[PDB]
Design a protein around this ligand. Sequence first.
Ligand SMILES: Nc1ncnc2c1ncn2[C@@H]1O[C@H](COP(=O)(O)OP(=O)(O)O)[C@@H](O)[C@H]1O
Ligand SMILES: [Mg+2]
Length: 351
Amino acid sequence: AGASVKVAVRVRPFNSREMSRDSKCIIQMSGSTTTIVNPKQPKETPKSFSFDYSYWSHTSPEDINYASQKQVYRDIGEEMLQHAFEGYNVCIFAYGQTGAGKSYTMMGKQEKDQQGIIPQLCEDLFSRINDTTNDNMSYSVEVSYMEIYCERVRDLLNPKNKGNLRVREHPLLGPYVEDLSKLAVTSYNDIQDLMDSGNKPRTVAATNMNETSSRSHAVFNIIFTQKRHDAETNITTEKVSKISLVDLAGSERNINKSLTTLGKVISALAEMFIPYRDSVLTWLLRENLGGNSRTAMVAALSPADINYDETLSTLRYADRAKQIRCNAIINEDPNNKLIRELKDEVTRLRD
Ligand SMILES: Nc1ncnc2c1ncn2[C@@H]1O[C@H](COP(=O)(O)OP(=O)(O)O)[C@@H](O)[C@H]1O
Ligand SMILES: [Mg+2]
């Protein structure tokens, strides 16, 4: 019995498509509880689901029960960031139907407080670092941003590179992306400009009217290194935590082989031969799924009757995701133990 995957769901206002079809609301929330009415058989018992958070954002932020970008960051964003500081690897991944709110949640709009989890976590990470007053604490921050489209990886921080970059198994340390930019960053503004250009490099699709393809997964990785200098011994100990921030492809379903595999993975872990390597995504995230990571899912939900089956499917995946156990441990520099002895050895040797 370790820790389980945190699972939040979030329902947005009607979008243009839903208003055009005079869509009604079939989603209701109450504390941590989400209820969905079948608008096709309005005579069926509604189905209810209980999560770590049921966020009601169906209205406007002028309203009091509207779950804001700040609230959702502060509930799971901060929690995972604090765990990164404790020396744990963390993952949040946005799951749901095209249009349901995944990229609003993870990225936001950046116009006014519309900033999503990723930009907030980068403001908070850098904000905490520069508030440090222990001089024996110094810090390193390395970012990777990639797209998986149709099982082929691209580098969003290095667009000129057209590499279909190869997903390799390290024979000892597990999977990595060969020759993927790892860029040292020392300012929030600096990391802003990179996930800015990163986003602009995403595969665009005439099908989404030349908006970002709904079939592309966006993985934003920070390698966070904490350096503690000891004067007495002049050893520096390092904490290394990897933060994985994920904006999945559209859940509705060769080139979806990534997303269908995620399902089968989530489902295997829930009832507990795991097909981590049947797809690039489940492979690269083998560890964040049932391994050495603290992981949260934020499922986006359409409020609209027209999306009932997709929106029901998201809820049943969310609810299965709630039964996954993570075996996360603290990044432990063996040198802390070393420092404990050799310092004590010197002081008792001054009786
Ligand atoms: N909680 C929310 N508050 C306001 N607008 C939202 C919310 N969630 C989604 N939207 C809007 O819904 C639309 C869908 O974009 P998005 O949901 O990010 O796509 P996807 O779900 O495919 O990632 C956008 O216009 C976005 O601004
Ligand atoms: Mg999106």
